[PDB]
DNA sequence: GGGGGAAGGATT
DNA sequence: TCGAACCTCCCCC
């Protein structure tokens, strides 16, 4: 199986580059401004001349602001970003059938039947790259692999603006080499676990008894590990339909009044609904964070979809029972629609 | 013993 | 410090 990995370079702020290119060159964040204080919320994104200095997604505006006082600042625009992602994977159904698009920036393509070796594969890879370059003025980087896991591993190597394959001789290294962290599905609270166990590279879990592994990460995590460290990982291209839809806001303040949290929690309803476009929910879910960062969630399926007015009062419903079972202040309040007709 | 569904956890 | 979207206790057969 040849695998075709696409990942669009910093997004976000790649695409307000092509909508202003007089962008380019300069520092630019994207950012999730919370409505809480001077500059509270979180960079989205950034470009590489502002990570270059550390401005990286996750931090707070504040704390990037500090680093680069003079970057260029721009508010989240998703639906932009989300329609400019449509349209490049829709290019991409071009060289393939069979095509995962995991992401509004990443998008998977069994490319097996188009090609016959790595060097037809990574030829391919450059055409898909001018003609997004060509389309839509954005560069994004290839990975091509055996599986889905190393292609992406070999993308996350030659990112920005590369491509990169890893042959079967180099999976094998990967296999004995590669900081097992830096595989995908492991981020910082499995890696730790794993540093703990002795394991620090794949091929380390063939190795250690399996019930120790699985009683460290659980089941799923201990057999996908094993089965990448035995160069068996099988996981099939798939067709990917939008599972849940839903929206979350930070309030003013923090509170545990329901008429104070409401028209937050019905501004939440609003916009999931609009997002929604034509999808009709069987299942609603209120979805509280905590002061303390926690979250904790509240759901009803329905027998029948979900219209605005029932979202509506069952939401209350919901949110009265969190409130009920649990004694925390409510930060953030939302809500999240499923199980589609 | 193990489906299957609700809620919490981890990841990206 | 923001926020959208597969895996890990109890009813029930
Ligand atoms: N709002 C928000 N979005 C995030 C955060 N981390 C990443 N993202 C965005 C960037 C695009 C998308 C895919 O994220 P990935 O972690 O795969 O990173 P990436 O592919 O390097 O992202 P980018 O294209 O911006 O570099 O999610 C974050 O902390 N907050
Ligand atoms: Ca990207
Ligand atoms: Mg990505
Ligand atoms: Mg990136
Ligand atoms: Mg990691």
Same mark, same amino acid.
Request: hydrophobic share 40%; charged share 35%.
């Given at each position: ?172 290294? @990967?296999?004995?080499? *590669?900081? &097992? ?5 492991? /981020?910082? %609270?499995?890696?730790? =676990?794993? $540093?703990? !166990?002795?394991?620090?590279? @794949?091929?380390?879990? *063939?190795? &250690? ?5 699985? /009683?460290? %990460?659980?089941?799923? =995590?201990? $057999?996908? !590990? ?18 849940? %839809? ?96």
């Amino acid at each position: 199986m040849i695998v075709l990995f696409v990942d669009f370079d910093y997004f976000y702020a790649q695409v307000e580059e092509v909508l202003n290119p007089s962008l380019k060159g300069k520092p630019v964040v994207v950012c999730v401004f919370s409505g809480r204080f001077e500059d509270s919320g979180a960079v989205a994104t950034a470009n590489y001349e502002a990570r270059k200095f550390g401005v990286k997604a996750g931090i707070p505006i504040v704390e990037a602001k500090k680093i680069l006082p003079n970057a260029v600042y721009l508010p989240m625009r998703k639906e932009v970003y989300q329609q400019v992602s449509s349209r490049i994977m829709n290019l991409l159904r071009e060289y393939s059938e069979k095509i995962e698009i995991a992401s509004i920036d990443e998008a998977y393509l069994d490319i097996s039947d188009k090609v016959r070796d790595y060097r037809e594969a990574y030829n391919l890879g450059l055409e898909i790259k001018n003609k997004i370059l060509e389309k839509e003025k954005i560069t994004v980087t290839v990975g091509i692999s055996k599986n889905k896991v190393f292609a992406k591993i070999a993308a996350d190597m030659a990112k920005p603006n590369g491509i990169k394959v890893i042959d079967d001789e180099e999976v094998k290294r @990967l296999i004995r080499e *590669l900081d &097992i962290a830096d595989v995908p599905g492991i /981020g910082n %609270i499995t890696a730790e =676990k794993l $540093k703990k !166990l002795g394991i620090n590279k @794949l091929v380390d879990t *063939l190795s &250690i008894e399996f019930d120790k592994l699985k /009683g460290m %990460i659980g089941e799923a =995590k201990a $057999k996908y !590990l094993i089965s990448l460290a035995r160069d068996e990982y099988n996981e099939p291209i798939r067709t990917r339909v939008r599972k849940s %839809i839903g929206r979350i806001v930070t309030m003013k303040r923090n509170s545990r009044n329901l008429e104070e949290i409401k028209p937050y929690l019905f501004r939440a309803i609003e916009e999931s609904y609009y997002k929604l476009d034509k999808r009709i929910p069987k299942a609603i879910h209120v979805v509280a964070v905590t002061e303390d960062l926690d979250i904790v969630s509240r759901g009803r399926t329905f027998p029948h979809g979900i219209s605005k007015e029932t979202a509506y009062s069952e939401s209350v419903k919901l949110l009265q029972k969190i409130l009920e079972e649990d004694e925390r202040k409510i930060r953030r309040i939302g809500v999240r629609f499923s199980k589609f007709i």
